[PDB]
Write a protein that binds this ligand. Structure first.
Ligand code: E6D
Length: 212
């Protein structure tokens, strides 16, 4: 695999979003990976619906948190609507998929990256954007404004984001806190520290959609 990957440069990443006060990061994370895999497979970059996952995933807890895996499983079983058909409201409502017409895209499955393994995560990122988790509760992460981040942070993962690339000493992450956080909404997290958890627990739990 190559030294640099950046799915933004391949036209496979949509603009940065803001989840607001709602604990919907799990849905934002899953949607980034859907937007990426559909571009890779079909050639078209579209925005898909975080709100639909928020409303419709009965394995997750709405604005009180949830699971990237179950969001991706839902898209493989049913499908997902475009974002403008089912836009983000920042509050859980009833599932409105049926009344909003046919789904816009559908995947075939979900796979996990081998956990606690930097090379396995880089290999997966080289193929497509990946949903990853990290510990975001610390003030250092909250206040990050740029540079290659090394903490301070622990491994108590609590926030789902998307890995959209990497370089020699970092992994490139799209966050859902708006463009005013980090590097236009992104963070470069240091890699190569030898800590099997990853910086801020980044290697704890990573998933990606499968589409034939
Ligand atoms: C993430 C978010 O919107 O902001 C985090 C600061 C959500 O709170 C969230 O879904 N967190 C999630 C942890 C990862 C994403 C799996 C979570 O705690 N979900 C609850 C399920 C289980 C831990 C009981």
């Amino acid at each position: 695999i190559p030294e640099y990957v950046d799915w933004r440069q391949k036209g496979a990443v949509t603009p940065v979003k803001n989840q607001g006060s709602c604990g919907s990061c799990w849905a934002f994370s899953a949607v980034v990976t859907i937007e990426g895999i559909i571009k890779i497979r079909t050639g078209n970059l579209n925005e898909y619906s975080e709100q639909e996952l928020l409303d419709c995933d009965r394995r997750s807890y709405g604005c009180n948190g949830g699971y990237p895996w179950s969001a991706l499983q839902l898209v493989a079983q049913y499908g997902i609507h475009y974002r403008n058909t089912y836009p983000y409201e920042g509050v859980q409502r009833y599932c409105r998929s049926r009344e909003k017409g046919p789904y816009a895209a559908k995947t075939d499955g979900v796979r996990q990256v081998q956990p606690y393994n930097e090379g396995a995560l880089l290999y997966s990122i080289a193929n497509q954007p990946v949903s990853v988790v990290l510990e975001a509760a610390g003030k250092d992460f909250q206040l990050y404004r740029g540079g290659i981040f090394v903490g301070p942070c622990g491994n108590k993962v609590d926030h789902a984001v998307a890995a959209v690339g990497y370089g020699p000493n970092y992994i490139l992450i799209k966050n859902s806190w708006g463009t005013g956080w980090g590097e236009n909404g992104y963070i470069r997290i240091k890699r190569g520290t030898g800590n099997s958890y990853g910086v801020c627990g980044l290697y704890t739990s990573s998933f990606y959609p499968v589409k034939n």
